Amino acid sequence: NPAIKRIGNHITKSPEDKREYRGLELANGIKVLLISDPTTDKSSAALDVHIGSLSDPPNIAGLSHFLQHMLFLGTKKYPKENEYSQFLSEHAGSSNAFTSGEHTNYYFDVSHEHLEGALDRFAQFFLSPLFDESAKDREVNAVDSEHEKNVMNDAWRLFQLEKATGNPKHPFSKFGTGNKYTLETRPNQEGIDVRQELLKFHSAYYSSNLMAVVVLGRESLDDLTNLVVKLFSEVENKNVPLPEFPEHPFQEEHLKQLYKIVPIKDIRNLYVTFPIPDLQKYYKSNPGHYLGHLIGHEGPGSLLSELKSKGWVNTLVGGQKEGARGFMFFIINVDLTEEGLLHVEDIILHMFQYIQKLRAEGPQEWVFQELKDLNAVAFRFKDKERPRGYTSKIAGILHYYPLEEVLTAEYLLEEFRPDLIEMVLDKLRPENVRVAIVSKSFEGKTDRTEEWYGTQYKQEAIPDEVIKKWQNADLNGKFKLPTKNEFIPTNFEILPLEKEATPYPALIKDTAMSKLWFKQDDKFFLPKANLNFEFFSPFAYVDPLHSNMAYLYLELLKDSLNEYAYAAELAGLSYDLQNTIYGMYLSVKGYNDKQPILLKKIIEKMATFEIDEKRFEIIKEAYMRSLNNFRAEQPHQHAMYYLRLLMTEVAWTKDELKEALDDVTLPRLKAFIPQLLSRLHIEALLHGNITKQAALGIMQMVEDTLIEHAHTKPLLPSQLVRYREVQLPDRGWFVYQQRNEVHNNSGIEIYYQTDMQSTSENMFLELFAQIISEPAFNTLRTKEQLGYIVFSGPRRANGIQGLRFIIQSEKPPHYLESRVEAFLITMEKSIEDMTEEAFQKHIQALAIRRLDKPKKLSAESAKYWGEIISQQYNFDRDNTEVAYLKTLTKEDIIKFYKEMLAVDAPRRHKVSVHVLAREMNLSQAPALPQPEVIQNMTEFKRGLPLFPLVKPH
Amino acid sequence: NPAIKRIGNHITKSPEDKREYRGLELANGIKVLLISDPTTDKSSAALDVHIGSLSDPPNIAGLSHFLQHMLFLGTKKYPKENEYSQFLSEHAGSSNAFTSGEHTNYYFDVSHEHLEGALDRFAQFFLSPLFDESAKDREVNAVDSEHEKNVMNDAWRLFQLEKATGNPKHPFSKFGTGNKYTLETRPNQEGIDVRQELLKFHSAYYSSNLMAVVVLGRESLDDLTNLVVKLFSEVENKNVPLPEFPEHPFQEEHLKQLYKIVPIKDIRNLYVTFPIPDLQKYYKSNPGHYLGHLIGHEGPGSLLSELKSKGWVNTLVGGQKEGARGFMFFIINVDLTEEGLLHVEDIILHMFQYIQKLRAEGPQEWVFQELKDLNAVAFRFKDKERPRGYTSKIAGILHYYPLEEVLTAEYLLEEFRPDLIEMVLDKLRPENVRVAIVSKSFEGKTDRTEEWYGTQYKQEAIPDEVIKKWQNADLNGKFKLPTKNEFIPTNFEILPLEKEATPYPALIKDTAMSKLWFKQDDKFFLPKANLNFEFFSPFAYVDPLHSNMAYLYLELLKDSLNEYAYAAELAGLSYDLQNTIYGMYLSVKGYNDKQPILLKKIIEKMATFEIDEKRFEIIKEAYMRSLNNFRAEQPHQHAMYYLRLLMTEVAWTKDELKEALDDVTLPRLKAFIPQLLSRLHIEALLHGNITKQAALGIMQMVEDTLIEHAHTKPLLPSQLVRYREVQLPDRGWFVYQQRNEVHNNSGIEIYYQTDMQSTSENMFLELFAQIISEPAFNTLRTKEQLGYIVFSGPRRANGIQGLRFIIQSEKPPHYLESRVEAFLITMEKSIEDMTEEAFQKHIQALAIRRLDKPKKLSAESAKYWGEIISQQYNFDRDNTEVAYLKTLTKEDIIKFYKEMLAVDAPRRHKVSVHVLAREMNLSQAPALPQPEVIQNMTEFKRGLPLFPLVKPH
Ligand SMILES: [Zn+2]
Ligand SMILES: [Zn+2]
């Protein structure tokens, strides 16, 4: 075969991975991985191009990002603007893309029987895009919206600020995302045809070298091979030299700098950065990882431990940070306490003291050994990935590793390289450093402004005597290297499947204190378990005060055993502990071998907890800011939040919690804990590599610890209350209005309440949602360009359901309402006009979606956990509901729409949340009734019935 | 309701379709569609019975066909033989029926007011047919006559020859029409009684489970439902199983066969046939339509293109052909060049080469998607069909599609199935082929004759060595898939109706070169336009040589323009270009979006045309043949032809044209075109979704591009002569006599010239025509059985008019002549004794007929285009004429009759054309004068005056 330059030799894989693999290089230079999985419900492909933002013309910022958006909007072979989304939607598929500095990456998935149909329209993106003049004009608004979204985000401003602070001559300084000014306004002044610039960039850069493609489907490796050469062999090779950036954007005048930055949120952060060369070629030894593991450690003797005891820092992340081909960073970033802010200089000294300890001790082979062994274990027993993310990730890394190593490359490490470790370590020095402090105490004290986000900052040379001081950092005896990690699992035997083994979780314990659901794993066979525990107490949410305490208690508890839990987390054994509106949730995930030890330590510490006063005072302050910082979340997030508050029987607002926070007192918390724990009920799902007796033992141990240390007794059955959704009246419409003080966009959520969850009502909503799914996106975004964020879909809460719309835009909420209303009429009409096939396609699509099998334990566990926490206990819901769905008729969906959804529906139940921006041809919209505006959340709830609660099976 | 088994309310229809639909399944098994159109002037109904000639008793060919004729002739509820035809005639209605292999379809229309009366008389066809004994003896001759007109027609002989060459045991071999021998002579000899047989067949097969019914009217869906049930639920259900023909009439020994066949006309054709399975069940992917689209394609890279370039072929038809439940055909038919005839083996090689190309590429999804989307817009913007044809057609398809899917079913493709396409393509192989060659060069070299038509042929096995060469057909670089079609309409915006917009076309330009009529569509609102142009030049018809050249010129233009325009018409944009007696004629119709492009290209090529010598010689020999092939046209067609020749001032006969054809020469033609183009007037009608300024813009383009490329200057007003009619003398009778050399049947035209067209003279003539219409058919055909073809009505040429009778018959024309004379006398009494109420019935019937409103844009255009080409411009004609009609009395019509038409009218002007056959109680006929016998057409024209020409209203 002439279309193929070579066929790689094995692909090395996990011995647990039953998927089959072939690597290739096409004649035109495209690198390909083929994944055959005869099991898979969905198929996918990804194509990564080794070109991104850094290659934008200095002329037209964000052109690569704009091009990425445009490829979806039409091709020569498939010229319909939305041919691609629509095809995917009707065959159970999804798509997305992102562009970074050096890559632009495109992925989709689809029902396994439509790989080729999908792949054909996909390939066309890279052969002959239209860049339609009219689509270009509309879509420019979508990216402007991406950018608006981002302007008031601290992560994004910091991201761009770093760039605007190194060498301006350097591609690194570029604005990646782009906007209206950048992509339309500017280029129109200056007289640029942008459709031609899009066409030019595509031809210049979308070359077949520089491209890597990955395809996963049920077809054989041979069938997959033939499919790929036919579709991709005809992408033109233009031999484009791969861009390189040998010179660091941080030159000498950029080092030894201090930036003082004012954030949007009330946060207190310190960023420490060292320029380093590109360590990527050293992937087999990975010096940066070794140094990241150490600087980053959180166990006894670590940097964070001491910085925490001094009460300066709560949180630390350090390690290798990516740059581009030719440059990298090493970072040590930290959050700050009120004290910590006044001791930055000391903090950085402690940082250099730890680095000195590393130099003094020399590189440690046993540490490398441990890192290497963990990775080997992680690679073996790795969970099966969802096809979509898997093809996207492999497409990216196909540009860095030989075909044969793509799967292992960034897991397995082989070489101990003291010289490299020591070379990188030699760049982590006080000369050669950059410091950034993010605090609101810099309001008014700044002299500089960032062009693209508006970030306000000041810039100073770090005084030579300060550098000198850090250079003379001596050994601090509080800093020790970590100990042998004792949580490393050593037992991976999969216990045989029991005789009494069951396809779904079984109630194996039903006492007054405990309800234990159990299932031994019958499909994945990795040595892992998930242990889920819901703890009920009326005292966790009784009032705003108690809610606060429940939160602090668990934050304080997690903080206290962080040092101990860190070791376990590196050993692939983690936990999750958070308060809920019913009490607490605890989940332990990972290798089953040492789970009992971790769990026991957690429960022992729960029932025995001794609050340190200093930790209490610090965490309280952080929580105060956390509550305040909601003021700064996105308008669409506000809308969702207000609806939740508005539709739930009891729910405490953030202003309520905040007010109550001052009354939270150390004595009072010491009192709350034993009260919380005196009466509970525990419902649990134990699922994975465990036997019934092990499971029963685990439950009992949890119970027995709690009884022994906290004198826990059972809760009455009538105390196990669940909350209800408010019942909206036939033909009613309520509007709640609020202002977002930070963002210059509006948010809206529209909720059409339908009825209680039930097989029939579930599928009516679900199928209608499916039919309008891509049309909503296509109408409200692609055509009308209302905002970047446009969502429709089902809403499920408290056993009740409905249809929702969520939009964020610069257009007012009253206007958004009318456009969604206009859209609903267009939908009734198109359901009428569509053929019985079109209808039957959407049924089949919803079917494939609902019946998609879990690929990993956690995914299965989540399904079951959903059944348990909602008390519906419907483990076979998918077969039942899908069976019933195929029964449905184009006729059934129209009466449902007319009964519940249409503007003049007898049983329409509308509520809207309008969240105003911070300072406030197309189809025909219907006339709307005058809404009743909600003045007061409590009164609104008081004046309406509450729904029943859904019945168990 | 117990009379209705199932009721489905949805029929998926087009978004623009204003009519309303309800599907039904009756208790007796009848599938029903009702169409409610409150606006129609004509209601209609149809019934399709799923039984045809393929179910005829082996010993009585043509029974089903015969039975179809008989059902018109009387019923129990209505025993008067012509009650049905008369009723429809007196209420502006018309009826007809056809019999096919597995279908018998009956349909009528009538004044919307009289649906129930007509439907009732119609329902009876299916309850209590008389099958009158004496009616049966007469109507056999009608059938025999129908077969007789077919005997010498090449298409029918071929049709039956295919049947004669497959399995004789298969019901496919049956002769479907029947004749005197079949349905009378053989059965009497064999002892059969056919009335009994008609009755057995009717009762055995005319069962309700085998019937579909369609009713269209103004009445609501609910009234229509009651009406159909009242009249059709009483049809007995005999629970008849549907015939099934799973075995193919072509078996292994009927393949690899070659047939050499002698035509009647001088025609050279090649028929290639592949037997295939019934593909009907795959209607939603339509594999045969996909493969037909490609093999049948005419654009660059197609099979046709290569074949045409070798100078072997002119036209090509490809694709699937129906057979019956259980079997189908795939065909590739081509006409032949003198060279082509010598190169049949190579032509077929190329066919298989093209098929090979498709195998090697595999199913092309973009092609299918393109077809899908074209159908989607085709269906969206389809013209409103005439009720009669619409009911009939739908009645047919209700047998194949669920009630809800009928309107869309023959229109919308749904899923692309590459696997079926490959299943069908796999049948298109040399081992599976039949080949037929039709040419005069087999005259006297054949040894077989076909029973029913007498077709002369020879049959040979195709040598295995020839088969084996076709199997090895390799790839040919001349063949490619089509290009993406760039005529696909994109823009369907219906422009707002202008302030200065007129009900009728307005004269918006009046240059010495251009007279432009314009009207913006004010009633249909579809994104289409009709662009009509007449170009006047004296040089188009100055002499036979110049007629010939004008013809050849436009034929050659279209030939060269074909590759370009094929894609255009695939996309609902087409044109029509032909020489007229005056100058020439161009029409561009379809979606208006790309009309200017095509139109401009046509006028450009027109004015810039450079002839291909090979193309010239080929089209010339085809035109030579076509010219003398008129020898083989029907006697009644000869009749009409000579009348035209005799009655019009200047007219070239085909003998004159054929003779002058030899002097047409490449240089002479090259010289003719600029001479033709140099001086022109242009009259145009631009009607549709178009704007006054845009119309002006279109004319301008047309003129500009003529002026720029052909130096076209205006004609003089006195040059713009239209032709006049010969003026017959009072009491004169002339007979022109000729014989048909091919058909053993005679034809006749009788013309009673009255006077110049004028409101009164038009309405006298067309009211009399109305009154005598039905009686003429009943008397001369149904009663007297003179022949299958019996016609009467108005005749309009060159502004003059009169009454015509056309008859084709076994009888001599001198006899035919007295019988229409006899008829005219008994029409005199019939009107004399006609009741005053009956008279208004006819007046009302004419009224509704003339005042009936257009349903398509093109129907409206044609009505205006009529007024323009005839230079009358009476755009509100029907109102003024119908208003005058109502003034008319019995006395007035009688007065018009004895003065103009009666045997002894002082102003009777009679011409008779008698076409003799190849080899040549009752009301009494009147004594006739000796006619003057026309020896010479020129002598006759010269001895008579010429009428004036009509004044432009
Ligand atoms: Zn984006
Ligand atoms: Zn017939």
B284, B365, B484 member nearest A117 (Cβ): B365
Test the A interface: residue of B16, B361, B368, B484 with most A CBs within 10 Å: B484
In a domain, B305, yes or no: yes
Domain shared by A236 and A258, yes or no? no
A77, A83, A835 member nearest B484 (Cβ): A77
**Are A228 and A24 spatial neighbours (Cβ–Cβ below 8 Å)?**
yes
**Measured between beta carbons, which residues in chain B are less than 8 angstroms from residue A115?**
none
Test the A interface: residue of B369, B415, B484 with most A CBs within 10 Å: B369
Torsion of CA B38, B39, B44, B46, to 10 degrees: -70
**Measured between beta carbons, which residues in chain A are less than 8 angstroms from residue B418?**
116
In chain A, how long is the greatest CA-to-CA distance?
81
CA distance A316 to A321: 14
A584, amino acid identity: M
Domain shared by B356 and B450, yes or no? yes
Rounded to the nearest whole angstrom, what is the distance from the C-alpha of residue A6 to the centroid of ligand 2? Answer: 70
Q: Looking at residue B310, what DSSP letter applies?
A: T
- Single out the residue in B193, B216, B242 at which a domain terminates: B242
Domain shared by A691 and A701, yes or no? yes
Rounded to the nearest whole angstrom, what is the distance from the C-alpha of residue B148 to the centroid of ligand 2? Answer: 11
Point out the ligand nearest to the CA of residue A143. 1
Query: Scanning every residue of chain B, which has its alpha carbon at the shortest distance from the alpha carbon of A834?
Result: B12
- A834 contacts B12? CB cut-off 8 A: yes
In chain B, how long is the greatest CA-to-CA distance?
81
**Measured between beta carbons, which residues in chain B are less than 8 angstroms from residue A76?**
484
In a domain, A492, yes or no: no
B9, B362, B412 member nearest A835 (Cβ): B412
What does DSSP say about strands B31-36 and B211-217: parallel, antiparallel, or unpaired? Answer: parallel
Rounded to the nearest whole angstrom, what is the distance from the C-alpha of residue A68 to the centroid of ligand 1? Answer: 7
Q: If you search the block for the tokens 């200095």, which residue do you land on?
A: A58
Select from B157, B149, B349, B148 the least CA-distant residue to B259. B157
* Residue A127 touches partner B, C-beta closer than 8 Å: no
Rounded to the nearest whole angstrom, what is the distance from the C-alpha of residue A143 to the centroid of ligand 1? Answer: 6
* Residue B496 touches partner A, C-beta closer than 8 Å: no
Domain shared by B194 and B317, yes or no? no
Domain shared by B233 and B253, yes or no? no
Give me the domain span that covers residue B944. Answer: 726-953
CA distance B484 to chain A (A): 7
Domain shared by A519 and A630, yes or no? yes
CA distance B492 to chain A (A): 12
**Are A736 and A911 spatial neighbours (Cβ–Cβ below 8 Å)?**
yes
B794, amino acid identity: P
Q: Where are the alpha helices (DSSP H) in A152-286?
A: 154-163, 180, 186-188, 194-205, 221-232
A573, amino acid identity: L
Domain shared by A712 and A772, yes or no? no
**Measured between beta carbons, which residues in chain B are less than 8 angstroms from residue A839?**
none
- Single out the residue in A189, A212, A242 at which a domain terminates: A242
CA distance A198 to A876: 50
CA distance A347 to B298: 80
Q: What's the first-to-final CA gap in chain A, in angstroms? A: 60
CA distance B281 to chain A (A): 15
Rounded to the nearest whole angstrom, what is the distance from the C-alpha of residue A803 to the centroid of ligand 1? Answer: 26
Instruction: Tell which A residues from 824 to 853 touch B, by Cβ distance under 8 Å.
Output: 829, 832-838
Domain shared by A518 and A436, yes or no? no
Query: Which two three-digit tokens encode residue B473?
Result: 């057909």
* Residue B366 touches partner A, C-beta closer than 8 Å: yes
**Measured between beta carbons, which residues in chain B are less than 8 angstroms from residue A837?**
284, 414-415
Query: Scanning every residue of chain A, which has its alpha carbon at the shortest distance from the alpha carbon of B364?
Result: A120
CA distance A810 to A788: 10
Give all strands (DSSP E) within A157-287, no chain letters: 211-217, 257-262, 269-276
Give all strands (DSSP E) within A298-394, no chain letters: 316-324, 327-335
- Single out the residue in A212, A242, A272 at which a domain terminates: A242
Point out the ligand nearest to the CA of residue A179. 1
Q: Looking at residue B697, what DSSP letter applies?
A: H
CA distance A843 to A827: 16
The answer for residues whose C-beta is within 8 angstroms of residue A9's C-beta and 6 or more apart is: A23, A403, A404
CA distance B372 to chain A (A): 12
In a domain, B478, yes or no: no
Q: If you search the block for the tokens 């891509």, which residue do you land on?
A: A774
Run of H or E residues at B713:
strand B713-714
- B284 contacts A833? CB cut-off 8 A: no
Query: Which two three-digit tokens encode residue A261?
Result: 């930055």
B362, B366, B408 member nearest A78 (Cβ): B366
Run of H or E residues at A679:
strand A679-688
Burial of A141 (0-12, 13-18, 19+ CB in 10 A): buried
**Measured between beta carbons, which residues in chain A are less than 8 angstroms from residue B494?**
none
- A829 contacts B10? CB cut-off 8 A: no
Select from A550, A531, A540 the least CA-distant residue to A588. A531
Query: Which two three-digit tokens encode residue A327?
Result: 């440059």
Handedness of CA A390, A394, A397, A401 (dihedral sign): positive
Cα–chain center distance at B470: 38
Domain shared by A736 and A621, yes or no? no
CATH number at residue A465: 3.30.830.10
**Are B111 and B850 spatial neighbours (Cβ–Cβ below 8 Å)?**
no
Domain shared by A141 and A227, yes or no? yes
In a domain, B522, yes or no: yes
**Measured between beta carbons, which residues in chain A are less than 8 angstroms from residue B373?**
80
Instruction: Tell which B residues from 251 to 290 touch A, by Cβ distance under 8 Å.
Output: 284
CB pairs under 8 A between A and B: 42
In a domain, A651, yes or no: yes
- A835 contacts B408? CB cut-off 8 A: yes
Q: Count of alpha carbons within 13 Å of A813, Cβ hemisphere only?
A: 27
φ and ψ at residue B746, rounded to 5 degrees: -110, 155
In a domain, B271, yes or no: yes
A402, amino acid identity: P
**Are B285 and B414 spatial neighbours (Cβ–Cβ below 8 Å)?**
yes
Run of H or E residues at A354:
helix A344-361
- A83 contacts B369? CB cut-off 8 A: yes
- A120 contacts B405? CB cut-off 8 A: no
Test the B interface: residue of A128, A226, A234, A835 with most B CBs within 10 Å: A835
Query: Which two three-digit tokens encode residue A523?
Result: 């499909």
In a domain, A493, yes or no: no
Select from A605, A612, A628, A526 the least CA-distant residue to A572. A526
In a domain, B484, yes or no: no
Tell me which method was used to determine the 3D structure: X-ray
Burial of B684 (0-12, 13-18, 19+ CB in 10 A): buried
Domain shared by A704 and A742, yes or no? no
Rounded to the nearest whole angstrom, what is the distance from the C-alpha of residue A145 to the centroid of ligand 1? Answer: 9
Domain shared by A704 and A757, yes or no? no
Burial of A336 (0-12, 13-18, 19+ CB in 10 A): buried
- Give me the residues near ligand 2 (ion), CB cutoff below 5 Å: B 146
CA distance A834 to B408: 10
DSSP-derived secondary structure for B728-779: PPTTEEEEEEEE-SS-SSEEEEEEEEEEE--HHHHHHHHHHHHHHHHHHHII
Query: Scanning every residue of chain A, which has its alpha carbon at the shortest distance from the alpha carbon of B16?
Result: A833
Run of H or E residues at B422:
helix B418-425
Domain count, chain A: 4
Query: Which two three-digit tokens encode residue B147?
Result: 């077969």
Select from B798, B695, B809 the least CA-distant residue to B748. B809
Handedness of CA B844, B846, B849, B850 (dihedral sign): negative
Rounded to the nearest whole angstrom, what is the distance from the C-alpha of residue B318 to the centroid of ligand 2? Answer: 29
Point out the ligand nearest to the CA of residue B67. 2
Instruction: Tell which A residues from 868 to 907 touch B, by Cβ distance under 8 Å.
Output: 890-891, 894
* Residue A133 touches partner B, C-beta closer than 8 Å: no
